[PDB]
Amino acid sequence: MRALFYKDGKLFTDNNFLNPVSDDNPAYEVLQHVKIPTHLTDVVVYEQTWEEALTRLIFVGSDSKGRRQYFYGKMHV
């Protein structure tokens, strides 16, 4: 799954946030439903639909200790 970069509600294909993803990107639906904790940095959101996200890994970010924290859908185990 494609790794998208997140910043202030918007999504980008690069980690520097210079190339915006198309406004109809499927992940915007996922973002309407999923809250991204504000303390995380280096947030990666997978390009998939909200339906697909329900049972899968949705996003990953780095906490203040530089450790990666994974976040899964409501119907994931």
UniProtKB/Swiss-Prot annotation:
Spell out the subcellular localization from the entry.
Virion
The record's induction entry says: Expressed in the late phase of the viral replicative cycle.
Q: Which residues form a coiled coil?
A: none
Q: Where are the transmembrane segments?
A: none
User: Which domain of life does the UniProt lineage start with?
Assistant: Viruses
Q: What does this protein do?
A: Releases the supercoiling and torsional tension of DNA introduced during the DNA replication and transcription by transiently cleaving and rejoining one strand of the DNA duplex. Introduces a single-strand break via transesterification at the specific target site 5'-[CT]CCTTp site in duplex DNA. The scissile phosphodiester is attacked by the catalytic tyrosine of the enzyme, resulting in the formation of a DNA-(3'-phosphotyrosyl)-enzyme intermediate and the expulsion of a 5'-OH DNA strand. The free DNA strand then undergoes passage around the unbroken strand thus removing DNA supercoils.
Which protein family is it in? Belongs to the type IB topoisomerase family.
**Which protein are we looking at?**
DNA topoisomerase 1B
Q: Write down the species.
A: Vaccinia virus (strain Western Reserve) (VACV)
Which section of the whole protein is represented?
Answer: 1 to 77 of 314
